[PDB]
A paper describes a structure:
We hypothesized that the ChemoG1 conformation observed in the crystal structure exists only transiently in solution and identified interface mutations to stabilize it (that is, eGFP: A206K and T225R; HT7: E143R, E147R and L271E). The fluorescence intensity of eGFP was not affected by the surface mutations. Despite the ionic nature of some of the interactions, the FRET was minimally affected by changes in pH or salt concentration. In U-2 OS cells, the stepwise improvement in FRET of SiR-labeled ChemoG1 to ChemoG5 was confirmed by fluorescence microscopy with a maximum FRET/eGFP ratio of 16.4 ± 2.7 for ChemoG5 that, in turn, was not noticeably affected by changes in the local environment after expression in different subcellular locations. Labeling ChemoG5 with different rhodamine fluorophores yielded efficient FRET pairs with acceptor maximum fluorescence emission wavelengths ranging from 556 nm (Janelia Fluor525 (JF525)) to 686 nm (JF669; FRET efficiencies of ≥94%). Transposing the structural features of ChemoG5 to the ChemoX constructs led to optimized ChemoB, ChemoC and ChemoY variants all exhibiting near-quantitative FRET efficiencies (≥94%) after SiR labeling.
We hypothesized that engineering a reversible interaction between a FP and fluorescently labeled SLP would enable the straightforward development of FRET biosensors with large dynamic ranges. By engineering an interaction interface between a FP and the rhodamine-labeled HaloTag, we developed FRET pairs (ChemoX) with near-quantitative FRET efficiency. In conclusion, ChemoX is a chemogenetic platform of FRET pairs that enables the development of biosensors with high dynamic ranges attributed to the reversible interaction of FPs with a fluorescently labeled HaloTag.
Residue numbers in the entry: 3 to 63, 67 to 229, 238 to 529
């Protein structure tokens, strides 16, 4: 079942349709990778020009390539129906226009997952958005709702597609879907969940025939978060550069310093700060060359971030601090704490920088990618030229699907590809397999200092994690002095995006037990 989807699967799509007496056929082929929920396909019209706009056919033209996270892999009906496959039937109601009626078989034929469909459209106005071709060549992001249909041993699916019309209006296409398996072998009948979808339509500049190129990403969710950033912007001059930081909470007492990593900013602390501000001052700077801080032309090694954070702390006159750190902000926090141990009253850390002795400790699905990130040729193309760390690695570091509002918040500091230099130097500084030896030695030193320190420690971890596997999170919580471990449930690297209420509330509760 799910075993046939561990790699890249070739896809073939063939449709035969009839809309208002207009007959047409479409062929398509490509490849799917359920690990990312990814689809790459090109569809051509084999009978001439399409009598309907291409966006109307997207949903008809293989939801088995959706990415089901591990904690809801028992709700993936589509994969458990393979290789025999399932029958998919739909009735799509275009608002104030016609309707499509489709019937398809999604099955394995040889080594290819093929999707053969019949389509039939009726009652379409000749001057409507569909037959008049008033649809814009784009596509929106939708929520596809799934529930079990134990009578037919299948599922019932409902959602509403929003098609952009060229006059600025929206055409609604109400979807009513039904999937039942082809083979009698038992399948998975899921609880109520949904799929978060996103699609990008484009053209091949060398294709002469009427065609459509499609890139799609789908992620299941809804079986177990504010997007705003209401903080007033603050700036301080640090080594001739301006650095942006959030400053809230009472002015007295021990401040709490929040340190982000790659490729985020203080935006990753937007849902944690409100739990801490009512009792403690919250300081959350944007790293140099990141966020809203100035982006000078540096090599942006870890040492460069050490210089600017040291001068940021002194610029704000901070005496004693509590640290809430994540990813490379944790290496900055532990290193500074090792060098200023009399000024740290507590450390709350999550998915933090540690010496990774072998690549087999790295997430196997992300090993090929991060080894390609750590090259001066392919690595710069991926991160600098193509912005893969923002568009791909970042949404793969969150179990739940990041919305477009949240992605645009992370996209803003790196709209210009020349400013993406810290996005590429950071993964090359990761101490993996003994390289680079200077970071390995530095990280080994603050890990050693941490093991001999009585400072309060609070470790957040998730499953399966990335930097900190669950077994490693359990080992360190036992041997580190005065450590309290918290399991936040499922998680990859940005644990603040999967369970921000548990992180912030436990920190607010843990902060009261310290002497500050
Ligand atoms: Cl990184």
């Amino acid at each position: 079942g799910e075993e046939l989807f561990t790699g890249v699967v070739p896809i073939l799509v063939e449709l035969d349709g009839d809309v208002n007496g207009h007959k047409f056929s479409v062929s398509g082929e490509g490849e799917g990778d359920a690990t990312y929920g990814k689809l790459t396909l090109k569809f051509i019209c084999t009978t001439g020009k399409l009598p309907v706009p291409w966006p109307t056919l997207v949903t008809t033209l293989v939801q088995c390539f959706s990415r089901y996270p591990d904690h809801m892999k028992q709700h993936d009906f589509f994969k458990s129906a393979m290789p025999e496959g399932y029958v998919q039937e739909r009735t799509i109601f275009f608002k104030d226009d016609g309707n499509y009626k489709t019937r398809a078989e999604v099955k394995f034929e040889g080594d290819t997952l093929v999707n053969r469909i019949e389509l039939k459209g009726i009652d379409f106005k000749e001057d409507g958005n569909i037959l008049g071709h008033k649809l814009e060549y784009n596509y929106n992001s939708h929520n596809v709702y799934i529930m079990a249909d134990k009578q037919k041993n299948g599922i019932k699916v409902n959602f509403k597609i929003r098609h952009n019309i060229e006059d600025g209006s929206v055409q609604l296409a109400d979807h009513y879907q039904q999937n039942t398996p082809i083979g009698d072998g038992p399948v998975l009948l899921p609880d109520n969940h949904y799929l978060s979808t996103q699609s990008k339509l484009s053209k091949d500049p060398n294709e002469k025939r009427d065609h459509m190129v499609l890139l799609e990403f789908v992620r299941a969710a809804g079986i177990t978060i504010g997007t705003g950033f209401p903080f007033d912007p603050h700036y301080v001059e640090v080594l001739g550069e301006r650095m942006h930081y959030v400053d809230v909470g009472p002015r007295d007492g021990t401040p709490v310093l929040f340190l982000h990593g790659n490729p985020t900013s203080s935006y990753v602390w937007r849902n944690i700060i409100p739990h801490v501000a009512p009792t403690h001052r919250c300081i959350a700077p944007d790293l140099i060359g990141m966020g809203k801080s100035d982006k000078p032309d540096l090599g942006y090694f870890f040492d460069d971030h050490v210089r600017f954070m040291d001068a940021f702390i002194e610029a704000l006159g901070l005496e004693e601090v509590v640290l809430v750190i994540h990813d490379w902000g944790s290496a900055l926090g532990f290193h500074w704490a090792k060098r200023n141990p009399e000024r740290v009253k507590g450390i709350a850390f999550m998915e933090f920088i540690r010496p990774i002795p072998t690549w087999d400790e790295w997430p196997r699905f992300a090993r090929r990618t991060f080894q390609a990130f750590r090259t001066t040729d392919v690595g710069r193309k991926l991160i600098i030229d193509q912005n893969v760390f923002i568009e791909g690695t970042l949404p793969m570091g969150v179990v739940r699907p990041l919305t477009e509002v949240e992605m645009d918040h992370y996209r803003e500091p790196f709209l210009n590809p020349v400013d993406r230099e810290p996005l590429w130097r950071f993964p090359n500084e990761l101490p993996i397999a003994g390289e680079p030896a200077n970071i390995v030695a530095l990280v080994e030193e603050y890990m050693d200092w941490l093991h001999q320190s009585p400072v309060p420690k609070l470790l957040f971890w998730g499953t399966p994690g990335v930097l900190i596997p669950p077994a490693e999170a359990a080992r360190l919580a036992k041997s580190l002095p005065n450590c309290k471990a918290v399991d936040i449930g499922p998680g990859e690297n940005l644990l603040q995006e999967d369970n921000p209420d548990l992180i912030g509330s436990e920190i607010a509760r843990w902060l009261s037990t310290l002497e500050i």
